[model samples]
Target chain A: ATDRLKLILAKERTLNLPYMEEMRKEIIAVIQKYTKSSDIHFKTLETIEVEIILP
Target chain B: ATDRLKLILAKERTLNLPYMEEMRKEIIAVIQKYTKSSDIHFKTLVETIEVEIILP
Candidate 1:
């Protein structure tokens, strides 16, 4: 695979700039507390899109 | 509410701009097969939004 994820928003310094892994950690702390079904996943995309797929 | 916000997925309405509701309406056709419309909740955000399935 190639790495062409040139630019993400937040100028690399916005409040939620942890972007991927680091931000994932924070979501769980709040979401996890709220529900056991908490399955949060963030991604790099236009407008910082996010989702989770389960089967 | 203590109700669990369970969800499947949605393609986001992008703030419901033009060519918006058309997609949402159809996506629901697929989801409605397995879930209920009353359970559908739209969570708006700065960018896109979460089209919560809120499964039963």
Candidate 2:
């Protein structure tokens, strides 16, 4: 499992920016598909929060 | 793994709105240690990028 743990951490950077760029294209297609830009709501809280972006 | 895809998709929105907020919080939890909640920096940055693509 230690190897798995290391694997997960290894996946971290691989999954972050580059991963999102891939998802960005796909996610935007899906999010933009159902939810219009009008629906995206940015929230203000302890950490950055957003919701209702899904129409 | 097919299971991993379902695992990933199953994780969907179970995190957000309930969607992004959920994931963002947890994401912040990780990066917040060394990074602070700046993880959201990328999320919103990506958000804006799409907004531009969608705006047209």
Candidate 3:
């Protein structure tokens, strides 16, 4: 079994990015194409992770 | 001092809305924003919620 993934965008050092939130949808669309065809056990969970990020 | 509150989006009911799955994310994002901005006491628990949403 092999899992393939492609990174359309990468994070930068300054935490500044040009692409908008729509990019997230495009990436999910690519995954959905294969996910629908494959017998993948999918779970949609809303995880509330609280963390303190010191800048 | 008191707490801070804000609502970014309005409520809308449409089954076939083009902005579908992302809406779920957006809702959570707003929730998270408030959660992080305020002094909220949060805890995780394993729960089983079974419901029957049928016309009575």
Candidate 4:
């Protein structure tokens, strides 16, 4: 699991910026309904908070 | 710009799952210190928010 975790972590970096945003929306859209907090919070461009709830 | 946006969008998806997490962390880490709010709000495995600033 540890080695696999490392591999998975490395793979994630390969994703680009915008596509990652779309992916974030895709995942958020599904879980937003169940989320206990807000979907995304952008106080500043450098401050973004995406909260979700998973069963 | 639109075409470039599309290309960038597609490129982002090429990244694998865990790498994405690391990437998210990487992007987040830089901004986290300056961030007005908390860095991550991971309620589920999918949802992730990372904010950053780039000076022109």
Calculate DockQ per candidate and list them: 0.04, 0.04, 0.03, 0.04
Can you tell me the DockQ of model 2?
0.04
lDDT per residue for candidate 3 within A1-55, as digits (tens), equals 3332221222223332233234334434443442332332222212111111111
Specify the poorest-scoring 10-residue window by lDDT in model 4 chain A. A1-10
Tens-place lDDT per residue, model 1, A1-55, is: 2111111111122223223343334433333332323344555542333343222
**Model 3 residue A37 lDDT score:** 27
By the lDDT metric, which is better: model 2 or model 3? 3
Worst 10 residues of 1 chain A by lDDT: A2-11
For candidate 4, give the DockQ: 0.04
Per-residue lDDT tens digits of candidate 3, residues B1-56?
Answer: 23322212212233123443354344334344423433322221112111111111
Looking at candidate 2, what is the lDDT of residue A19?
40
Worst 10 residues of 3 chain B by lDDT: B47-56
Give TM per candidate.
Answer: 0.33, 0.24, 0.22, 0.24
TM-score of chain A for candidate 2?
0.32
Candidate topping lDDT = 1
> How much of the real interface does each model capture, measured as fnat?
0.00, 0.00, 0.00, 0.00
Per-residue lDDT of A1-55 in model 4, one digit per residue for the tens? 1111110111122234544444334434433332323434322122123422222
Task: Rank by TM-score, highest first.
Answer: 1, 4, 2, 3
